[PDB]
Every structure is written in structure tokens, then in C-alpha cells.
Design a protein around this ligand. Structure first.
Ligand SMILES: NC(=O)c1ccc[n+]([C@@H]2O[C@H](COP(=O)([O-])OP(=O)(O)OC[C@H]3O[C@@H](n4cnc5c(N)ncnc54)[C@H](OP(=O)(O)O)[C@@H]3O)[C@@H](O)[C@H]2O)c1
Ligand SMILES: NC(=O)c1ccc[n+]([C@@H]2O[C@H](COP(=O)([O-])OP(=O)(O)OC[C@H]3O[C@@H](n4cnc5c(N)ncnc54)[C@H](OP(=O)(O)O)[C@@H]3O)[C@@H](O)[C@H]2O)c1
Lengths: 122, 326, 122, 326
């Protein structure tokens, strides 16, 4: 129940340690990864980053997995924040799907020299 | 190789080895011997001496103070630490309430004939006292010039972090050190829990019983020697440990460690003490000694420290087979 | 006129006790229900929850009943918050109506064995 | 069953029963008797003694201090509390202004021949002094080592909460206790208003007049006994209460309570005192006594405490018919 204070460029966020400990493999969930951002003088973790985005990042832990991009935050900026906080590929995949994306197919000519070469001009 | 170290991240510089007064001062040894032990330590660069209101019901502090006063050493050249918690039979004479911390420290200072101690420690955690009260009291005695700094003893890392957050919350002074038990057969806290506190909030460790009360010296390889701590009236509990099943197991492992000592060219006690100082997280080790011979030998642990290679440490871990999981 | 401080995951809210005492049966209006969330060290009630939503929750008490979902807050998340703060079914009903909902009808065959059974395949 | 209790949620441990000095010390009883009462209480584990600048115009504090000094009891084994508000005829010698709290406590400490008290109380609320000034003054005398803690007396829960919020606002020290009147015929505040403060901000209750000045002892079943408090010069007001219409009603109900006492196997005074300690919210009850007999009997209330079952409590509520609405 120990509380944690995360300061996003001046904007103060507060949560419980158990809330973050829920997702260990993320930056805020792993003590060794967030250690770098701790300010022992103010007893808070400080990130010189985008403010509007963190709300959703924190809600992700509080909700237990809900990663919704705030209406007022550009998809390119929010996606960078998701990657910075290391939420993982599963969450990222779940995210792009909802944002209306996903899809990657197309093998490739194995018989190199011949097939693969012909299948490229056809 | 660095004889002097910062206590945690504070500006207080202590020798990597200090001398304690539990069992010995005002108890097992004569005041003459106590003066001899302290003189030997001081002349060898040791500047850290630890005592407690509970040791020999206050007599340890009285003896420690008589020596300092008699020798005339400059107060600024010493780092005296004392612990508070058990100060008497009355209900209000124990614990970490504001009442006992102030009265306890004031009384210790009186017995020590000193205006102040460099570090005052809560001898153990107190479930019956809110953290705020304790941190405000420690901060108070520091502002009154009764102590320069304060520390915890036998507190979990969770409790130490609580005192620190409470201090930040109310603009109080955080603790700078934890006095934890540490030797080859008690490695958990110092190796797994404290390092994080050291790097995160600068709290350093000042370890005690490096020889597990003598058990790790090898002197009990075959029975309870006469005049050893284990034979003293009142330490039957220690005697029970040594002769226990687990006790026999330790003694067996010590015979394995002896070969390591010979390879490093030192005695077992020197190896045991040097082992405790192998990691930065440990600021200093408090030694115990019933005579000058023991102290002169133990101080030699500093020469062994440089030889403790990764390989050697791994070897000792195999023999002990008790390395704690991170 | 005593003042109350409610801290929503770091976001600081402040109001008068009489404003909350207006709706006793809610979590914030009932001393026994909010007691659990009080932090005696900072003299505030702390909730490890969704930030954007609380604005409207507090305005509900200040306005005297107006429960409007913030444009930037998903209906599913806001509805959960309304239930958590225990605003009551009346407010909830009033809310869903405005959000464009409400409606539940259809009895059910009483003559069990016969009627109710036939009325299901017809 | 727990003789010692924490005062509210602070770390200060007080006996569930304390001894007061109103009316008796320096007034109704001889200093010899006072020494006898205190010795009896101390030897029985009671560590809490309450006095006030107003009691017998300061003589009560002088008598209390003479005994402590004479007996030589360790200061750390006692919990001395004193109240401030009425300190003289002059306009500035009363109230909770910074001026009177500092001067008042300094003078009490002088009469007590003590460096400090464990808890200093605002004897009553002060409408003419801003809360901030009062909380800053109490905090000041604590930082000066004149008191360990402070508390309120006769304050509403609204006022206690104000002092607490003011303390948090300015990083001052909140009060840890309220000294409220409490007995079978005055239950409102302690049962309805204080419990919330206890659980919310840790403020505990230290109750007074458990026997309603003797009224609940049953000694007034048929008239004003000679030498009873009600007969003393200056307590006509108390005599008026006892003989009043409501007074007769109480005495009638006490005759009903007597059967409860016999069933529990104790005397009425013991039942009345034990009743006050039935709920956790009450940290301690301050007793009054004009002789040793009374004190020895009253202390027996601790043996009754375990027998106060829900059933018995419900029964007493029926007889009293004054249980406060939550
Ligand atoms: N924070 C706490 O709660 C706490 C608790 C305990 C201790 N401490 C501190 O830590 C200090 C050290 O603890 P400790 O006394 O247990 O230390 P230790 O190093 O474990 O044991 C020292 C004792 O072992 C024996 N010994 C030492 N060197 C020896 C050698 N070379 N050969 C043979 N025997 C030797 C001596 O006893 P014999 O000669 O009598 O056998 C000596 O008294 C204390 O004095 C105290 O200041 C703190
Ligand atoms: N916070 C405040 O403003 C405040 C106000 C008032 C008091 N107090 C504190 O609370 C303390 C206790 O108050 P209190 O004196 O009113 O207490 P109490 O318990 O209501 O009354 C005690 C008095 O009743 C009589 N008595 C006690 N035990 C008896 C027994 N077993 N049999 C017969 N008579 C008995 C004695 O008077 P007689 O023998 O003379 O009849 C004795 O002086 C005070 O001394 C003071 O420290 C605080």
C-alpha cells in the first residue's frame, strides 16, 4: 500500500505501489528500470515528458489493462509514450487494433535465384 | 583499500571497522581492558564506537565515557553512536515514543559525559508508535544538538522507507543508516533488501556480529572453550546454538572455509570480517573483542579485502550454500 | 464550512463538507464510507482512480444534482465511476437517459409448462 | 485486561486509570494524605497524574511536585499532565493566547519543580484566540522541551478537528488527546462525537469525574454525608445538584444499578469506573480520592472490566435510559 508519486513535467500523479507491481515488465513496474528516474530530495519519480498522455498510461495499471489513447493526444505521440513506458507488444497490438490497424502478410520466393526473382516482376 | 567510508551517502566519514561494547564493556571485561581495547583501536585509525542504553544496564556507556574523558581525545575525532529502546522496567521507559527517545538519549548522554552522540539509533522497530512521532522525535534531538544524525536497527526495508517518506512529507530529517546483523550465516537483509535503499535513498548499512558472537572464529571447533562468550553466565542461549544440530553444521562448514583462509594467507576471523566489507552497501562493520589479541588480529581483515576476488567469493558461496536469492 | 480535500491519483480537489453532506447516501457524503480512504498524515481522502471523471462527480454535488459525463471520458469508464462513488440509481437512470438510453419491458409466460413454453417458439 | 494503553494513537503508554488532584491536593486533604494516595497509586502501576494551574490556585501543582521530588521516582516512569487556561486575575493571565500558554506552562513547571510535563492541555476552548496561534504555541512549548505532547479539554469535535487541520496546514503538531467528562449521566460527547476522531485522526479520550464527583458512588443515597465533597465550603453547587429533582432521580437509578454491581460481585464505584473503560476510544480514566480507602476500592474496577458483557451493558442502558443516539 506504500504510495508512489510520479511527476510528469510538473504534473503530479500519485498511485499505490501494488498498482504498478501489477505489470512488472514495464518501466514503472520494475524497480531497477525506474530507479534511474527517482528524485530522493522530493521522494518522486520525475519524467521530462508529454503530460496529456500519462493519464492514460496510469489508467492502464489502475484499470488492469485498459489502454485508451486520450482524444486530445496525437496517435504518433501517444504511441511513442507507450513504447517509452515499455508497456509491451501485447498492449501495443491491442492498442493499434482499437485505433483501427493491424495486418501484415506476404511470404517471399524461397527458390531465390529463380522463383523469388520472377515473382518480383510478376 | 579505502579505510574510511561515508556512512551511507551522508557526509559522516567512518572507519570501515568500528568497535562495539555489547557484552564486554562494564560486563565481561575490566575497565582496564576496555581502556586498552579503545586505545588500540583509536591508535589504529578506528573512529567509530557503538554502545547502547541496554548494554549492561547502562554501565557500558559509563565505561566508554570514562575512557574518552580520561584519554582526552578530541571529540571531533570520534564518531560515538548509541542505541535507544530498552531503558528500564517502567512501561514508559521503553519504545520509540517521543517521551522515551528524548529521555533515553538524554540519560545516555549523561552516562557518556558527552554533550551529544554522532548517530542515535532506534535499537529496533516499534509497532506501538506512529512513524511520524518517531521521526519528529529523532529530528528534535538532532535540532537540540543532542545528536548529529539518526539511524534504524533491525527495521525492515519497508519501515526504513516509511521513515524516509514521513520525513519528506513533514520536512523532517531522514535516517542515514541501518544497523543490521551480518555474517556468513545471516545474509538475507544486507544482500537482498538493503542495497536498493542504499542506491535509492542513500541509507547505508553498519553491520554487527561479524563473527556471529565468536561462532565464526573457529574457536568452537570442538567444544565450549573456558572463558568464551558461550560459557558466560547468561549466554546459555548462545551455548545452545553452538551445540545444536544446525550449530554442528556451521562448525563443519567453517572447517571447509579454513582452507580458503590459508589460501588467502589469513586467519578465519580476518576472512569473516573482510567478507562483510566486500560490498559497497556496507559502510562499516562493528567488531567485538574481549582482549587485545583478538582486536589486533581482527583489524588485519583490511589486508584481506583486496584478495576477495569474484572467484573466491563464488567459492565461499558454494561452501556456505546459503547465498540469498535476489 | 469545514473544507475537505479529495486527492484523485495526485489530482487535488477541494470542497466544503456541507457540499458533500448534501447527498448522505453516497460514498463521499457518508463519513463511515469515506473513512476508509482518509490519509491522516496529509488530511485528505485518497482514491487511486480515474482523473478526468472526478471533475463531473464533484460538480454533481456542487450543482445540486447535475451529472454530466465529460466529453473526453468514455461512457464505460464514467459509468463505473458513478457506481463506485455510489451516486445512486436515480442519478444513474437520469444519466443513461441523457446519454441516450433507458428502456426495459417484456413480461413472461406465467402458465409455465404450457403457455410460457409455446410463447417461446412463437 | 490490558492495564496499559496508548493515549489515543500516540506512542505514550498510560495506565487505564490515573489519579487527579482537583479539590483534594492542596485543598481538601493534607499533604500527608496526598503523599499516601500517590504512593499507593504508583505502587499499583498507575503512571498517570493530572493537575492544573487553576486547582487550588496552584497549590495542587506544588503538592504534586513536592511528592515526586521527595519520593525520588524516576521521571521517565511518570506521565504528568497539566492544564492551562485560568492562571490569574489579570486580563492577560487567562486563555489560550501564545502569551498565556507559554507563561502559564512555565509557571506550572516551576511550581511542579519539573523540567517538563508529558502532556499539556488547553483546559477549555478559547473563542478569543485564533486556532493557529494556539496550535503554534503548543507546538512551541513542545519544541522547547517544556512538554512532550499537547491535548484539548472541553473542546467540541469540530474544534479538535480544526486544531488538527491547522497543524497539518502549517507543519505543526496535532493534539493527541481530549480530556472529556464521562460517567453514567454524561455520555454524549465520549460516545457519539469522539469515536470518529479516534479512528480518523487518532485523538484519544482521557475522561474525568467518572463518579460525577462522588454522586455515582451511592454515598448520597439518603442525604449529604459529613465530610463529603458536597458538604465542603465552596461546593454548594454540587449540593444543589444532588438534592435537585434530577438529583433525586439519579439516586433512584443508582439503587437499581446496585443489583448489577452485586451480580458482577463488585461495589458500585468499581462498576461505574469499569463502565467508562468498556470502549477502546477511552484511553484512561482520571480518578479522584479523598482517602486511601477510596483509592484502593476504585482501583478494583480493573477486575470488573472483563465481566461487562453486551448483555450487562444493555441492561445498564435500560436502567439509565439515557443512551445517546448515534
Ligand atoms: N544493532 C543491534 O541491535 C546490535 C546487536 C548486537 C550487537 N551490536 C553491536 O555490534 C558489536 C559487535 O557485535 P559482537 O560482539 O557480536 O561481534 P562478533 O565479532 O560477532 O563477536 C565478537 C566476540 O567474539 C569473540 N572474538 C572476536 N574476535 C575473536 C578472535 N580473533 N578469536 C577468537 N574469538 C574472537 C569474542 O568473544 P569471547 O572472547 O568472549 O569468546 C568477542 O567478544 C557490539 O559490540 C555492538 O556494538 C548491535
Ligand atoms: N479536564 C477538566 O476540565 C477536568 C475537570 C474536572 C476534573 N478533572 C480531572 O479529573 C480528576 C477526577 O475528577 P473527580 O475528582 O470529579 O472524580 P470522581 O471519580 O468523579 O470523584 C472523586 C471524588 O468522589 C469521592 N469518592 C471517590 N471514590 C469514592 C468511593 N469509593 N466511595 C465514596 N466516595 C468516593 C471523593 O470525594 P469525597 O470523599 O470528598 O466525597 C473523591 O474526591 C480530577 O482530579 C482532575 O485531575 C479534569
Amino acid at each position: 500500500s506504500e504510495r508512489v508519486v510520479i511527476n510528469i513535467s510538473g504534473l503530479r500523479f500519485e498511485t499505490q505501489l501494488k498498482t504498478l507491481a501489477q505489470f512488472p515488465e514495464t518501466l514503472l513496474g520494475d524497480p531497477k528500470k525506474r530507479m534511474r528516474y527517482f528524485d530522493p530530495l522530493r521522494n518522486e519519480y520525475f519524467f521530462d515528458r508529454n503530460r496529456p498522455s500519462f493519464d492514460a498510461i496510469l489508467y492502464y495499471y489502475q484499470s488492469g489493462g485498459r489502454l485508451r489513447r486520450p482524444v486530445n493526444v496525437p496517435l504518433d505521440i501517444f504511441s511513442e509514450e507507450i513504447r517509452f513506458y515499455e508497456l509491451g507488444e501485447e498492449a501495443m497490438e491491442m492498442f493499434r487494433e482499437d485505433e483501427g490497424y493491424i495486418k501484415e502478410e506476404e511470404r517471399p520466393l524461397p527458390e531465390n535465384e529463380f522463383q523469388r526473382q520472377v515473382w518480383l516482376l510478376f | 583499500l579505502q579505510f574510511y567510508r561515508n556512512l551511507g551517502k551522508s557526509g559522516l566519514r567512518v572507519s570501515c571497522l568500528g568497535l562495539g561494547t555489547w557484552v564486554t564493556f562494564g560486563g565481561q571485561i575490566t575497565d582496564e581492558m576496555a581502556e586498552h581495547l579503545m586505545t588500540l583501536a583509536y591508535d589504529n585509525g578506528i573512529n567509530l564506537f557503538d554502545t547502547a542504553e541496554v548494554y549492561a544496564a547502562g554501565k557500558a556507556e559509563v565505561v566508554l565515557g570514562n575512557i574518552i574523558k580520561k584519554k582526552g581525545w578530541r571529540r571531533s575525532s570520534l564518531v560515538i553512536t548509541t542505541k535507544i529502546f530498552w531503558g528500564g522496567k517502567a512501561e514508559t521507559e521503553r519504545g520509540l515514543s517521543r517521551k522515551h527517545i528524548i529521555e533515553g538519549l538524554k540519560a545516555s548522554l549523561e552516562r557518556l559525559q558527552l554533550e551529544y552522540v554522532d548517530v542515535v539509533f532506534a535499537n529496533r522497530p516499534d509497532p506501538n508508535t506512529p512513524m511520524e512521532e518517531t521521526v519528529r522525535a529523532m529530528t528534535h534531538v538532532i535540532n537540540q544538538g543532542m545528536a548529529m544524525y539518526w539511524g534504524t536497527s533491525r527495521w525492515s526495508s519497508m519501515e526504513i522507507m516509511e521513515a524516509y517518506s514521513v520525513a519528506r512529507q513533514f520536512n523532517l530529517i531522514p535516517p542515514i543508516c541501518e544497523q543490521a546483523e551480518y555474517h556468513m550465516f545471516q545474509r538475507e537483509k544486507v544482500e537482498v533488501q538493503l542495497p536498493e535503499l542504499f542506491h535509492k535513498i542513500g541509507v547505508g548499512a553498519m553491520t554487527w556480529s561479524p563473527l556471529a558472537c565468536g561462532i565464526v572464529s573457529g574457536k568452537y571447533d570442538s567444544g565450549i572453550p573456558p572463558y568464551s562468550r558461550a560459557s558466560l553466565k547468561g549466554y546459555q542461549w548462545l551455548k545452545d546454538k553452538i551445540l545444536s544440530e544446525e550449530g554442528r553444521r556451521q562448525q563443519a562448514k567453517l572447517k571447509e572455509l579454513q582452507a580458503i583462509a590459508e589460501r588467502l594467507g589469513c586467519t578465519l576471523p580476518q576472512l569473516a570480517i573482510a567478507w562483510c566489507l566486500r560490498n559497497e552497501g556496507v559502510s562499516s562493520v562493528l567488531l567485538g573483542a574481549s582482549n587485545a589479541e583478538q582486536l589486533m588480529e581482527n583489524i588485519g581483515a583490511i589486508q584481506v579485502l583486496p584478495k576477495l576476488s569474484s572467484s573466491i567469493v563464488h567459492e565461499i558461496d558454494s561452501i556456505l550454500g546459503n547465498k540469498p536469492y535476489s
